[PDB]
Amino acid sequence: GSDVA
Amino acid sequence: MEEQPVWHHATSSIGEPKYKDGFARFDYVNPDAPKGGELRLSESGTFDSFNPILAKGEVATGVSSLVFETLLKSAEDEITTSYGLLAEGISYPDDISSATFRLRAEAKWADGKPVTPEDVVFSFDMVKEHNPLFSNYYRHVISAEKTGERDVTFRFDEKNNHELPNILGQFPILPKHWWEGQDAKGSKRDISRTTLEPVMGSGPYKIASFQAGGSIRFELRDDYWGKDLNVNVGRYNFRTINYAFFSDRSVQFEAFRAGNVDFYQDNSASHWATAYDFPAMKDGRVIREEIENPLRATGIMQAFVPNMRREKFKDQRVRQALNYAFDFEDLNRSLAHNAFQRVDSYFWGTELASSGLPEGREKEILEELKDKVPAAVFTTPYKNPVNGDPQKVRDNLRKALALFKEAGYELKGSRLVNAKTGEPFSFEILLSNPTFERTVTPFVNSVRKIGIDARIRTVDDSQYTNRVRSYDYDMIYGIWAQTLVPGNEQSDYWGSASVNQPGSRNYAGIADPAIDELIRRIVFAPNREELVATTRALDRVLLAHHYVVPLFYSKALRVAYWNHLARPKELPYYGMDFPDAWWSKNTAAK
Ligand SMILES: [Mg+2]
Ligand SMILES: [Mg+2]
């Protein structure tokens, strides 16, 4: 999945 | 000519299968894992359909993973190796012009009917008709046909597409008699439409109950045909697997903190560092792990993906300028607890990534396409901008403005406008959840400094899926993951034919003859050396076109889970096999 701050 | 068939219990697109014919189980499992207990999981968004193959509506991940099965099971302790699941074996000629699967005599649907070649043929035709991903993936597979009591033969449009026998083991097998049957209301079932009728499969779990859009309870079947099959020993242990759906990530995490959700995968570096100040985290009741396994042998591109179907993003100079405006160094330091690494390849983290200048075979492949590729592929290694200090931030923004000026956009009253029409340069960044906003806001603020009106539009997951399917966006926060064996899927990411076909993964709308030629060369690569060189050549060409603004990633999955869940002592080298190889400690304690 997408990784975020 | 044809020869006496050679049957195989497994297939591998890289190296040899680790396990021989007749192996008892995978090495990493607990062969004595007890059957029982409840596992409570969460899933983002919602669901409105149980149809496992139709690319319409919102489907729960648990349906395809727990209720349906494929012909082959991929080993998580190997790179691409797959072993017979519904198929006992696979046979193919040396030229790979076809592939035949022999189904297991013991394979049965949950209603007790046998899994037949007619089911495989129906499933193949239906995945191609109703699912754009499989329509592309199997585009070189012309047909599926019953060729024996338990045999299905797939015929191919061209020889030497080496991964076809392997990838044909990955589509779910559905019950033809059930989908062509009648429901309880006397209405004929229809695979071309969404359904909220609980679907029937051959898999270990059945849909026991559900609350449409909110939850699904999966229950382990004691009569699952494959319970003792080698690939299933020590797997499918929880008696009940409940999925609860959340549109609010904070509510989802609160359910985990309350012990109402047993496992949580944390995709936020700041949340991982700050949200775990709760009692169960201090006395061993909750376990946190940073697991590299599922990201080993995986290439990743995470990026801001502009939609080149829209006029505002057609100029390479504009797309390049957006990269000059993005400050990764500040984002990593100020918001992400320095957790991430900048991405600089579509195959980042693997040997398939292009680097430096092209040499050897890679350079030779690009040389035969010199009149069709960016001149930069031969002169300029791909690099991202770096913002080590405040003067550098202003200088990189000056470079962005220079590229915009070359493209015909100028600062007029501190607003970036089309120099001929006066129309302001503006765009919307479509996000699927408010959790992405904190990461994207610094980019919005940076482009606002050079007169661009960028605005975030956050929607829910159902609206997001519907908009992405039709390419209704200026820009998305996107991701493409890659294996060590690029193949038939590549045309779904950057192939010209996928641009104007809804539901593809060609989010940027790339259409390029040289890229198409490199994709064809990857699919029909005669050996590993040619595949690696061609993949690095494709990566180099994609990067030289500045189609996206590459973002960043990390090498480990962050997971937290309650201590009543037990995992194998050693996880499979290339995965977590969660939840299938995990089990309940409450059950083991009798
Ligand atoms: Mg979903
Ligand atoms: Mg599974």
Author numbering:
A (entry chain B): 2 to 6
B (entry chain A): 0 to 589
Q: Which passages does the manuscript contain on this structure?
A:
Phazolicin (PHZ) is a peptide antibiotic exhibiting narrow-spectrum activity against rhizobia closely related to its producer, Rhizobium sp. strain Pop5. We find that PHZ can enter S. meliloti cells through two distinct promiscuous peptide transporters, BacA and YejABEF, which belong to the SLiPT (SbmA-like peptide transporter) and ABC (ATP-binding cassette) transporter families, respectively. YejA and YejE are subunits of the YejABEF transporter, which is composed of two transmembrane subunits (YejB and YejE), two nucleotide-binding subunits (YejF2), and a periplasmic substrate-binding protein (SBP) (YejA). To obtain insights into the mechanism for the recognition of PHZ by the YejABEF transporter, we sought to determine the structure of the substrate-binding protein YejASm since in related transporters, the SBPs determine the specificity of transport.
